[PDB]
Amino acid sequence: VVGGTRAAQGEFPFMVRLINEENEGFCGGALYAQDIVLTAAHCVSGSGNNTSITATGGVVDLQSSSAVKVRSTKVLQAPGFTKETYGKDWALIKLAQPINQPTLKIATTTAYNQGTFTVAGWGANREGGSQQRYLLKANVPFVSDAACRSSSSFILVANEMICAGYPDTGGVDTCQGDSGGPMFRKDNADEWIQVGIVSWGYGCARPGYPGVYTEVSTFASAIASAARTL
Ligand SMILES: [Ca+2]
């Protein structure tokens, strides 16, 4: 996360750090269920039995001896996924045991696809920077699909992608190692709800280039339905 600050212990307790040992990937994710992690499709190489991914939960400090590290058993990657710029950027990871933390509810309508979001992760705080020890967080405003394209010239799958950040100035964004983490905000009951998954962009926090996130509301019923088979 670029332009952010340290999250407090317990602030976003649904956050997990993913290490895909097989392909050397470092990613974020959210506890969709205590034993099912919602992350990006591009964080995994496909669907099936997979015991190569590790989820670290419970802690903002990844070197903490309170950390809970649990291994995957199974991955379900969005059907038809090919690359994150073409959409469908979601996957579920079934864990061998639950991580005993609050879960993050996901948006199932577009009602919350606006306003000011929060993102969090342990990715770099600058382009080419290294990974973070402590979870970082930042607020990024919704950028309309139209405002996103005009500065960017990004080609969006509009219903599958939500943009966020400060295209006029840059300065705040998710970055390498944040992929798969949730983008979220408060709902009407003052509870956290997930509207995005950190998906892609062009560098990090560059003027003209907002971050692009998987638009969760579009995929919520396919996600819920896939999680039930897990
Ligand atoms: Ca959109």
Swiss-Prot record:
Q: Where is this site: Required for specificity?
A: 173
Listed A to Z, the keywords are: Disulfide bond, Hydrolase, Protease, Serine protease, Signal, Zymogen
According to the UniProt entry, its GO molecular function terms are:
serine-type endopeptidase activity
Q: Which SMART domains match?
A: Tryp_SPc
| Disulfide-bond pairs as recorded | 27-43, 148-163, 175-204
Instruction: List, in alphabetical order, the GO biological process terms annotated in this UniProt record.
Output: proteolysis
Which residues are in the Peptidase S1 domain? 1-228
Q: Which PANTHER family match?
A: ACROSIN-RELATED (PTHR24252), HYALIN (PTHR24252:SF7)
Q: Which family does it belong to?
A: Belongs to the peptidase S1 family.
Q: What is this protein called?
A: Trypsin
From the UniProt record, report the name of the gene that encodes this protein: sprT
